[PDB]
Structures are given as structure tokens and as C-alpha cells.
Amino acid sequence: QRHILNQSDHLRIDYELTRESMTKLRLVIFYSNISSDPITNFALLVASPKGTTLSLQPQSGNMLQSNSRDGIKQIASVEGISVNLGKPIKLKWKANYCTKGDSKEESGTTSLP
16 A cells, blocks of 8 residues: 655655546655654655646645654645556655754655556
8 A cells, every 4th residue: 555655764755546537646645754853844846747747735744753654644646648558657756854953855756656
């Protein structure tokens, strides 16, 4: 059920991926703080994948307490031909946040399963 978008030294990003229609996937993204210091000012940015409309809802909050599992949730959907076909859809994403006297960034492009 939970797939791992990304796992750094501080933050795990994972998600539930259901299929809601023949053209639409629904992602329920979860953010986990796996470190001993709080994370603040968290935000995910995302690009529309190549053959698809991306719909992003606002996240539950922008703060994760130390060792907080799923302290923020954010719903996205992906809709279009690629999902209808079995075409691999790539999410280009970037996160920014603050922890440990530091302003951090994390980025990638992950092929959704």
C-alpha cells in the first residue's frame, strides 16, 4: 500500500496510490520526520508529468515534530491518457524545509509504479 517516494536522513516521503477511474490515479502523500529534531516550513513542489494533468491539494500542515510518522498528509491526483494506458509516469518533485540549524532541499524524479 505505502510506496516510498523518498527517504533521506531526516524525512521520509511515502504515499497510498489508488486508482479512482480509468484515467485518474489518486495519491495520498505522507510526510514522516525520522530525525530527533523538528522539521519546519515544509513544502513539496511538483511538475505536471509529460502526458497528464496534476491536481495538488494543500497539505495538512507544514510542521513535523521529532520522530513523527505521517505528521502531514497531502492529496494529489494524476489524470490523463498515460494512466489509461500503462505508460510509466515520472513525478519531478522538490521539497524545502528547515531543521537542525539548516535550510534543506531534497529533489528527485520518481517513476510511479
